[PDB]
Enzyme design. Structure first.
Site: not given
Ligand SMILES: CO[C@H]1C[C@@H]2CC[C@@H](C)[C@@](O)(O2)C(=O)C(=O)N2CCCC[C@H]2C(=O)O[C@H]([C@H](C)C[C@@H]2CC[C@@H](O)[C@H](OC)C2)CC(=O)[C@H](C)/C=C(\C)[C@@H](O)[C@@H](OC)C(=O)[C@H](C)C[C@H](C)/C=C/C=C/C=C/1C
Length: 107
Positions: A36-37
Protein backbone atom coordinates in the site's frame (compact mmCIF):
# COMPACT_ATOMS: atom_id res chain seq x y z
CA UNK A 1 3.24 -6.82 18.87
CA UNK A 2 6.07 -6.28 16.40
CA UNK A 3 8.37 -9.07 15.24
CA UNK A 4 11.66 -8.40 13.48
CA UNK A 5 13.40 -10.51 10.82
CA UNK A 6 16.66 -8.93 9.71
CA UNK A 7 17.18 -8.38 6.00
CA UNK A 8 20.61 -6.75 6.33
CA UNK A 9 22.43 -6.25 9.64
CA UNK A 10 23.18 -2.83 11.08
CA UNK A 11 26.34 -1.82 12.92
CA UNK A 12 24.79 -3.48 15.96
CA UNK A 13 25.49 -0.61 18.35
CA UNK A 14 24.04 2.66 17.06
CA UNK A 15 20.33 2.70 17.96
CA UNK A 16 17.80 5.56 17.79
CA UNK A 17 18.06 7.81 20.85
CA UNK A 18 15.26 9.87 22.40
CA UNK A 19 14.44 12.94 20.32
CA UNK A 20 16.50 11.81 17.33
CA UNK A 21 15.01 11.82 13.85
CA UNK A 22 15.03 8.47 12.08
CA UNK A 23 15.69 8.52 8.34
CA UNK A 24 14.19 5.39 6.84
CA UNK A 25 13.13 3.78 3.59
CA UNK A 26 10.07 1.55 3.82
CA UNK A 27 7.52 -0.50 1.90
CA UNK A 28 4.22 -1.32 3.57
CA UNK A 29 2.09 -4.32 2.75
CA UNK A 30 -1.03 -5.98 4.17
CA UNK A 31 -0.25 -9.48 5.44
CA UNK A 32 -1.25 -11.78 2.57
CA UNK A 33 -2.47 -8.64 0.81
CA UNK A 34 -1.24 -5.85 -1.46
CA UNK A 35 1.56 -3.34 -0.95
CA UNK A 36 0.00 0.00 0.00
CA UNK A 37 2.99 2.33 0.24
CA UNK A 38 6.66 2.57 -0.69
CA UNK A 39 9.09 5.37 0.09
CA UNK A 40 11.50 3.51 -2.21
CA UNK A 41 9.13 3.68 -5.20
CA UNK A 42 9.04 7.48 -4.98
CA UNK A 43 12.76 7.62 -4.17
CA UNK A 44 12.24 9.68 -1.02
CA UNK A 45 13.40 8.68 2.49
CA UNK A 46 10.84 8.99 5.30
CA UNK A 47 11.66 10.86 8.52
CA UNK A 48 10.02 10.82 11.95
CA UNK A 49 10.88 11.75 15.54
CA UNK A 50 11.43 8.97 18.07
CA UNK A 51 9.04 9.05 21.02
CA UNK A 52 6.78 11.76 19.61
CA UNK A 53 3.93 9.40 18.70
CA UNK A 54 4.10 10.45 15.05
CA UNK A 55 3.84 6.92 13.67
CA UNK A 56 2.01 3.72 14.67
CA UNK A 57 3.55 1.94 17.67
CA UNK A 58 4.72 -1.10 15.74
CA UNK A 59 6.70 0.94 13.22
CA UNK A 60 8.40 3.02 15.90
CA UNK A 61 9.08 0.07 18.20
CA UNK A 62 10.58 -1.77 15.26
CA UNK A 63 12.88 1.11 14.33
CA UNK A 64 13.83 1.70 17.96
CA UNK A 65 15.37 -1.78 18.18
CA UNK A 66 17.31 -1.50 14.91
CA UNK A 67 20.90 -0.28 14.61
CA UNK A 68 22.27 2.16 12.02
CA UNK A 69 22.20 0.68 8.52
CA UNK A 70 20.00 -2.25 9.54
CA UNK A 71 17.16 -3.36 7.28
CA UNK A 72 14.43 -5.64 8.51
CA UNK A 73 10.98 -7.04 7.87
CA UNK A 74 8.56 -5.85 10.55
CA UNK A 75 5.36 -7.76 11.21
CA UNK A 76 2.92 -5.62 13.17
CA UNK A 77 -0.27 -6.99 14.71
CA UNK A 78 -3.38 -4.73 14.62
CA UNK A 79 -2.98 -3.57 18.24
CA UNK A 80 0.35 -1.92 17.34
CA UNK A 81 -0.92 -0.65 13.97
CA UNK A 82 -4.43 0.62 13.14
CA UNK A 83 -6.43 -1.74 15.36
CA UNK A 84 -10.15 -2.40 14.96
CA UNK A 85 -10.60 0.99 13.30
CA UNK A 86 -8.10 0.52 10.49
CA UNK A 87 -6.98 3.49 8.37
CA UNK A 88 -9.79 5.08 6.29
CA UNK A 89 -9.79 3.70 2.76
CA UNK A 90 -6.35 2.05 2.96
CA UNK A 91 -5.98 -0.31 5.94
CA UNK A 92 -9.01 -2.41 6.98
CA UNK A 93 -9.97 -3.28 10.58
CA UNK A 94 -7.78 -5.88 12.35
CA UNK A 95 -5.03 -5.75 9.76
CA UNK A 96 -1.61 -7.22 10.47
CA UNK A 97 0.92 -5.10 8.58
CA UNK A 98 4.27 -5.96 7.04
CA UNK A 99 6.90 -3.23 6.76
CA UNK A 100 10.30 -3.64 5.05
CA UNK A 101 12.29 -0.95 6.89
CA UNK A 102 15.86 0.27 6.44
CA UNK A 103 17.38 2.62 9.05
CA UNK A 104 19.46 4.85 6.80
CA UNK A 105 20.50 7.63 9.15
CA UNK A 106 19.88 9.28 12.51
CA UNK A 107 19.54 13.06 12.74
C1 LIG B 1 0.61 10.47 2.00
O1 LIG B 1 1.43 9.76 2.88
C2 LIG B 1 1.20 9.91 4.26
C3 LIG B 1 1.58 8.59 4.95
C4 LIG B 1 0.83 7.35 4.48
C5 LIG B 1 -0.66 7.41 4.94
C6 LIG B 1 -1.40 6.07 4.84
C7 LIG B 1 -0.57 4.95 5.51
C8 LIG B 1 -1.32 3.58 5.40
C9 LIG B 1 0.91 4.93 4.90
O2 LIG B 1 0.86 4.56 3.51
O3 LIG B 1 1.48 6.23 5.04
C10 LIG B 1 1.89 3.98 5.64
O4 LIG B 1 2.64 3.25 4.97
C11 LIG B 1 1.94 3.91 7.06
O5 LIG B 1 1.10 3.20 7.64
N1 LIG B 1 2.85 4.59 7.81
C12 LIG B 1 3.79 5.63 7.26
C13 LIG B 1 5.19 5.25 7.66
C14 LIG B 1 5.32 5.17 9.19
C15 LIG B 1 4.29 4.16 9.73
C16 LIG B 1 2.84 4.44 9.31
C17 LIG B 1 2.24 5.63 10.06
O6 LIG B 1 2.35 5.71 11.29
O7 LIG B 1 1.55 6.68 9.38
C18 LIG B 1 0.99 7.80 10.01
C19 LIG B 1 -0.46 7.42 10.40
C20 LIG B 1 -1.37 7.28 9.19
C21 LIG B 1 -1.07 8.44 11.39
C22 LIG B 1 -0.45 8.57 12.80
C23 LIG B 1 -0.42 7.23 13.58
C24 LIG B 1 0.19 7.34 14.99
C25 LIG B 1 -0.53 8.44 15.83
O8 LIG B 1 0.20 8.65 17.05
C26 LIG B 1 -0.65 9.84 15.07
O9 LIG B 1 -1.52 10.72 15.79
C27 LIG B 1 -2.88 10.39 15.96
C28 LIG B 1 -1.20 9.65 13.62
C29 LIG B 1 1.21 8.93 9.01
C30 LIG B 1 2.61 9.54 9.13
O10 LIG B 1 3.62 8.83 9.23
C31 LIG B 1 2.68 11.07 9.13
C32 LIG B 1 4.09 11.56 8.72
C33 LIG B 1 2.35 11.60 10.54
C34 LIG B 1 1.23 12.16 11.03
C35 LIG B 1 -0.03 12.39 10.19
C36 LIG B 1 1.09 12.63 12.51
O11 LIG B 1 2.22 12.18 13.27
C37 LIG B 1 0.99 14.20 12.67
O12 LIG B 1 0.51 14.42 13.97
C38 LIG B 1 -0.50 15.38 14.10
C39 LIG B 1 2.32 14.96 12.50
O13 LIG B 1 3.02 15.26 13.47
C40 LIG B 1 2.71 15.34 11.07
C41 LIG B 1 4.25 15.31 10.90
C42 LIG B 1 2.15 16.71 10.68
C43 LIG B 1 2.05 17.08 9.19
C44 LIG B 1 1.26 18.38 9.02
C45 LIG B 1 1.34 15.94 8.45
C46 LIG B 1 1.87 15.30 7.42
C47 LIG B 1 1.27 14.07 6.84
C48 LIG B 1 2.01 13.23 6.12
C49 LIG B 1 1.40 12.02 5.53
C50 LIG B 1 2.03 11.09 4.79
C51 LIG B 1 3.53 11.10 4.39
Amino acid sequence: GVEIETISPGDGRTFPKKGQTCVVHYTGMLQNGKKFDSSRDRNKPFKFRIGKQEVIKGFEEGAAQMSLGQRAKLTCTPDVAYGATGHPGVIPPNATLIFDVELLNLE
